[PDB]
Design a protein around this ligand. Structure first.
Ligand code: MXN
Ligand code: MXN
Ligand code: MXN
Ligand code: MXN
Ligand code: MXN
Ligand code: MXN
Ligand code: MXN
Ligand code: MXN
Lengths: 162, 164, 162, 163
């Protein structure tokens, strides 16, 4: 199983992602997205390109990425700070079930997995996440994939932010 | 024209949904320099949130301030700084969400008779006439002289419309 | 004619300002000092630095700055709420004439005028005020200088305050 | 027993005596409004037809203003510049511009109880007259509300008399 051979389910409508807000990454690859909250934003009223934006929030820090649909069930991300581009795919999505939402996404380095993000708002109770993670772990560099929520800063009265 | 911060208008908090449909907004006028060059995103409570508090995100480049909020009496929103634990009682001077010309509002929090903070948000490049008259009224209360235009000389973007 | 090259008359003795109290600004640059009454205050008895204070009063709002002499006939202001400093000069003073008092003061942003206050207590009848305003308007940013006393709030029995 | 209508009514000193005292702070007041407050007196405007002086009551960034003219029985009649509301005030005592500075205590009455009380000084409350005046006014009806007005005041930013 090489990264480029992973499932690429269709991107849900943006409204499905927004109804899921907010989410937390239960499993990631690199340490960048440990202890992170995901929020999805519609495009600004006056945005000429009408791109949506993904917010990755870690305490007082935030990574932002505009995204648009691309070929082969892909999302193409534009890093708003650096202009860096990346092609992402969904291994699966399971948004807005009666037990909440989960998904797992990935970007590839040819055959290696460059980054992995599994999000949920049900504390990892979705059976699809278990299965997806085990499958992702056996991809080249999938050894790095880890539970992302172990040693996270203490909160000060907010549920989803610190 | 109301004289002190305690006497400003307090319109009903619109349903969260009206705010979320306005996402994202920018702050055209603020009181302290904390909220210059800032984009606001409203977020619904997490599914498993015990208190069902919504969250206001104040995003300035690569930095974020977060505040959970819930309804309070007299059309108040009570905020909880997610990083500090610090509480603040806010009100809306006016809201004008989701018009054919977009959304604007102005919100504030008082230190008694003075204004401690002020946030005028819009997604229509400051063209709502309500916003202009709101800013003029707020400036006249104690400490209101610090309220200023918040979007001069902000950093350059890298491909994104609403973030940098 | 740029702001850094405007006239800089000697700051009169404090007593001359206090004998003028209260004044109103006839012409100002920003909107801040519209519909505003100026009162000058002597240092407190126990003040170590013996700085005098300028009070800018607009309804129930007050802006306060201690000030002291600086070089080149400057007044250095200390905003009492922030500790921010600003360097002011007098374009002219004409205090305590038989037709009352007037002056025009200004603070620069290099070659631009950042703020302008022309005060009087004679309903703007000092011919010096008209010439001074005409000169300052020609300076960069000075196109914003405007008459400050149109459509001010109505009073409830007091002459100088509302 | 001492009631408000029966307190001392010393003559109002000339305005210049108050202006020479500027600025003052209130060490004792009745209502909450006049805590952490600086008092500044202003002469009438040149063009003011009635020539009423003005008292300024400044608390941080907020100012209350009252024109005043002398009335009967050593009274000052105050005109709130924002409401147009009138109040008759008196001085329990004045001690302006001694070699130890200035102090006074003034009051206004709701019949036999005291509606407001303002004890000003520019000497950190060291005038012996001031202690005595306060003890007396506290025993008047409602005078139990009179308190020290300078306990937990906001921190300053380089000015001495304003914050
Ligand atoms: N999670 C995650 C990815 O970075 C992602 C994928 C699609 C759209 C936005 C963001
Ligand atoms: N899992 C789960 C919660 O609903 C949750 C917790 C933190 C951030 C987003 C969502
Ligand atoms: N802080 C701030 C915002 O403008 C705000 C956020 C939620 C409710 C009221 C006001
Ligand atoms: N005004 C306005 C725009 O719609 C706007 C611009 C930047 C960020 C949010 C919103
Ligand atoms: N008018 C005016 C200025 O703010 C100013 C100038 C000199 C001294 C005090 C205040
Ligand atoms: N000009 C003039 C008057 O004397 C005046 C009017 C209002 C405030 C200060 C002074
Ligand atoms: N202190 C005090 C009162 O407010 C007052 C009394 C007489 C004159 C001016 C002001
Ligand atoms: N008493 C005393 C102080 O020195 C003081 C402080 C502020 C204003 C006037 C006077």
């Amino acid at each position: 199983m090489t990264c480029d051979k992973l499932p690429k389910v269709p991107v849900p409508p943006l409204e499905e992602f927004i109804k899921s807000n907010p989410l937390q990454f239960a499993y990631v690859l690199t340490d960048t997205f440990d202890c992170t909250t995901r929020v999805y934003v519609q495009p600004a009223r006056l945005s000429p390109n009408q791109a949506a934006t993904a917010l990755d929030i870690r305490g007082s820090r935030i990574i932002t990425n505009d995204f648009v649909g691309g070929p082969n069930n892909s999302a193409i991300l534009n890093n708003c700070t650096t202009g860096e581009k990346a092609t992402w795919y969904f291994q699966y999505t399971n948004l807005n079930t009666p037990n909440g939402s989960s998904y797992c996404a990935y970007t590839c380095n040819g055959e290696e997995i460059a980054e992995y993000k599994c999000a949920n708002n049900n504390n990892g109770t979705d059976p699809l996440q278990k299965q997806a993670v085990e499958v992702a772990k056996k991809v080249p560099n999938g050894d790095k994939i880890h539970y992302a929520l172990d040693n996270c800063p203490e909160h000060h009265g907010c549920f989803a932010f610190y």
